[PDB]
Amino acid sequence: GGPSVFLFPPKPKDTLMISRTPEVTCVVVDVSHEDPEVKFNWYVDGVEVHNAKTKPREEQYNSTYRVVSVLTVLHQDWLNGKEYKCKVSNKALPAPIEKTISKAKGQPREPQVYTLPPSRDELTKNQVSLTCLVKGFYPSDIAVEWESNGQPENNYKTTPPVLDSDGSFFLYSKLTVDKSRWQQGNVFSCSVMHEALHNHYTQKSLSLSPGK
Amino acid sequence: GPSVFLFPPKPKDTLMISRTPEVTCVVVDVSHEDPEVKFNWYVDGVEVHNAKTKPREEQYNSTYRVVSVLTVLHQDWLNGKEYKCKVSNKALPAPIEKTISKAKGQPREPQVYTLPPSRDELTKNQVSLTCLVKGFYPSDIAVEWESNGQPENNYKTTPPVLDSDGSFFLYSKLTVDKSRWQQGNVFSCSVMHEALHNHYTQKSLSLSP
Ligand SMILES: *[C@@H]1O[C@H](CO)[C@@H](O[C@@H]2O[C@H](CO)[C@@H](O[C@H]3O[C@H](CO[C@H]4O[C@H](CO)[C@@H](O)[C@H](O)[C@@H]4O[C@@H]4O[C@H](CO)[C@@H](O[C@@H]5O[C@H](CO)[C@H](O)[C@H](O)[C@H]5O)[C@H](O)[C@H]4NC(C)=O)[C@@H](O)[C@H](O[C@H]4O[C@H](CO)[C@@H](O)[C@H](O)[C@@H]4O[C@@H]4O[C@H](CO)[C@@H](O)[C@H](O)[C@H]4NC(C)=O)[C@@H]3O)[C@H](O)[C@H]2NC(C)=O)[C@H](O)[C@H]1NC(C)=O
Numbered sequence: 075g076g077p078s079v080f081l082f083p084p085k086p087k088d089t090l091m092i093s094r095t096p097e098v099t100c101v102v103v104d105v106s107h108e109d110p111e112v113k114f115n116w117y118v119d120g121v122e123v124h125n126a127k128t129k130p131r132e133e134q135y136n137s138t139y140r141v142v143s144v145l146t147v148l149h150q151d152w153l154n155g156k157e158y159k160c161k162v163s164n165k166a167l168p169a170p171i172e173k174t175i176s177k178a179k180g181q182p183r184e185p186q187v188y189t190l191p192p193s194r195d196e197l198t199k200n201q202v203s204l205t206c207l208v209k210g211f212y213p214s215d216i217a218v219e220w221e222s223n224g225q226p227e228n229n230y231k232t233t234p235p236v237l238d239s240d241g242s243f244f245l246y247s248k249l250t251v252d253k254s255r256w257q258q259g260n261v262f263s264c265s266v267m268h269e270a271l272h273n274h275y276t277q278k279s280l281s282l283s284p285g286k
Numbered sequence: 287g288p289s290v291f292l293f294p295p296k297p298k299d300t301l302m303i304s305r306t307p308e309v310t311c312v313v314v315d316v317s318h319e320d321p322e323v324k325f326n327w328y329v330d331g332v333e334v335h336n337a338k339t340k341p342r343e344e345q346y347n348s349t350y351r352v353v354s355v356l357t358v359l360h361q362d363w364l365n366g367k368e369y370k371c372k373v374s375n376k377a378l379p380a381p382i383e384k385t386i387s388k389a390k391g392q393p394r395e396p397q398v399y400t401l402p403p404s405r406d407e408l409t410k411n412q413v414s415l416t417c418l419v420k421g422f423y424p425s426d427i428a429v430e431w432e433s434n435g436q437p438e439n440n441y442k443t444t445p446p447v448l449d450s451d452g453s454f455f456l457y458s459k460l461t462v463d464k465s466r467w468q469q470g471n472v473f474s475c476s477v478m479h480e481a482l483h484n485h486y487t488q489k490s491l492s493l494s495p
């Protein structure tokens with residue numbers, strides 16, 4: 075029966091930018107009225123820390139309690155693969171639940187970023203597919219965005235990372251634009267940001283340039 | 287009850303008359319003290335049991351992993367029919383529920399575009415051939431690559447993503463020693479989907495000057 079705990083890593087973007095603030099979030103659900111008290115203990119690489127901001131108990135519609143705890147994580151700590159452990163106690167369980175999260179273990183590998191123009195058979199349609207291929211990155215955490223003329227193209231989709239045959243990861247992003255917008259010869263760019271990239275950021279762009 | 291799981295057939299099994307599509311009922315966390323599990327199967331309500339309840343198996347922890355399997359008609363599954371697996375275990379409360387069927391809605395036909403590696407990838411000893419498959423519904427799909435009617439092995443295919451029109455897409459990526467691409471060898475993306483004339487289309491890709 076009883077309470078369950080879930081531990082959530084930061085957003086890859088948060089991790090990779092000095093500006094942003096990465097957080098690790100430990101959430102408890104199914105906390106009865108009979109024993110509503112929950113204690114959190116946090117550990118970084120096995121050693122307790124006490125800077126974690128813990129929200130007041132929010133009652134839920136199944137009459138079950140739910141309490142969140144948020145540890146602010148130093149960027150470089152995450153990127154050096156520090157281990158974050160949430161330890162949850164409730165007088166409703168034999169032993170206090172433990173969860174541990176980190177960046178995945180391995181050597182980082184740098185993203186290769188290629189753009190692919192739409193297929194020839196695709197010109198016949200009203201909308202076109204602009205492809206962004208990102209291969210050979212590790213670990214899998216990553217963000218992918220499209221823009222044109224300094225402004226975000228918000229009509230794209232990105233697949234999850236996929237475990238390649240050589241242990242690394244690949245993925246694809248597909249921006250769909252009104253075919254006319256490609257005709258005009260616009261410039262479209264696929265911004266990618268990952269730990270193994272210089273400045274944690276690269277961008278490549280694409281357009282139609284026939285003749286040579 | 288201990289966790290119970292229903293599973294569809296694979297896209298491919300369901301798309302060729304020759305194959306044998308099966309629905310699966312994996313029952314986890316069955317314990318030594320009370321195991322003698324019943325399974326019963328119903329399609330669109332009705333009693334059937336042409337199902338073969340696989341002989342048991344244990345696992346890593348103190349737990350058994352047990353399974354049943356039922357063979358299925360290609361049309362029945364393509365026609366939406368629900369498949370339910372009631373799983374009688376008198377260790378805990380009552381019968382168990384799990385329905386599954388195919389996703390509902392007008393099957394849409396996949397568009398298939400082969401893309402070639404970018405110039406930039408050409409300064410490497412292996413290249414990437416891209417196969418875009420978009421606009422398809424439902425997401426049950428199967429993708430393969432080949433050359434000279436012999437099958438290419440070094441490719442991986444991404445899962446399908448909900449595109450913004452409620453259709454799906456995916457990409458499949460074939461990896462070849464850049465020497466082969468030079469030759470001009472033809473490479474084939476083969477997509478199998480219910481909304482396809484004959485459940486199969488194939489697009490070709492080669493070095494065009
Ligand atoms: C009573 O009512 C309440 C609520 O109404 C019920 O609570 C629910 O209980 C469920 C358990 O039965 C919970 O389980 C699922 O939860 C997670 C997914 O939770 C996230 O996503 C859902 C939407 O899908 C959201 O609703 C949640 O709020 C969670 O959202 C994320 O929250 C994070 C922190 O808030 C967000 O982080 C942000 O990002 C910032 C970046 O810096 C910053 O860090 C902050 O973190 C924050 O800003 C994050 O972005 C949110 N994401 C989204 C998309 O919104 C799900 O993972 C669980 O699945 C796991 O566990 C099951 C087992 O139960 C596994 O089968 C499953 O596959 C997976 O576990 C896998 O296996 C192992 C070990 O288990 C792991 O090591 C693997 O990694 C793991 N993953 C795999 C295999 O893929 C689970 O299904 C549900 O969250 C609860 N809801 C709420 C609101 O809390 C309660 O159950 C009810 N009880 C009853 C009896 O009725």
Ligand SMILES: *[C@@H]1O[C@H](CO)[C@@H](O[C@@H]2O[C@H](CO)[C@@H](O[C@H]3O[C@H](CO[C@H]4O[C@H](CO)[C@@H](O)[C@H](O)[C@@H]4O[C@@H]4O[C@H](CO)[C@@H](O[C@@H]5O[C@H](CO)[C@H](O)[C@H](O)[C@H]5O)[C@H](O)[C@H]4NC(C)=O)[C@@H](O)[C@H](O[C@H]4O[C@H](CO)[C@@H](O)[C@H](O)[C@@H]4O[C@@H]4O[C@H](CO)[C@@H](O)[C@H](O)[C@H]4NC(C)=O)[C@@H]3O)[C@H](O)[C@H]2NC(C)=O)[C@H](O)[C@H]1NC(C)=O
Pocket residue numbers: 289291293294295296299307308309310311312314315345346347349
């Ligand atoms: C002791 O150790 C053992 C061994 O480790 C533990 O066993 C584990 O038991 C778990 C029960 O808790 C199992 O559940 C998890 O996994 C299922 C998915 O199952 C597949 O996934 C993994 C691969 O990652 C495999 O290990 C499994 O075996 C399953 O493999 C697929 O199953 C089929 C087998 O028949 C294959 O297809 C068949 O193939 C045939 C030919 O080969 C033929 O073609 C057939 O036609 C075809 O069917 C298929 O190919 C297999 N392989 C792959 C790679 O796919 C997962 O669904 C569970 O999570 C879901 O449900 C939980 C509820 O507990 C939710 O929390 C969670 O969110 C999640 O989704 C939600 O579930 C609800 C239902 O509750 C749905 O209605 C919702 O829609 C859904 N949400 C959303 C948003 O969609 C769960 O994660 C697990 O399989 C076992 N693990 C292992 C390693 O074996 C055991 O736990 C241990 N015991 C104890 C006490 O600790």
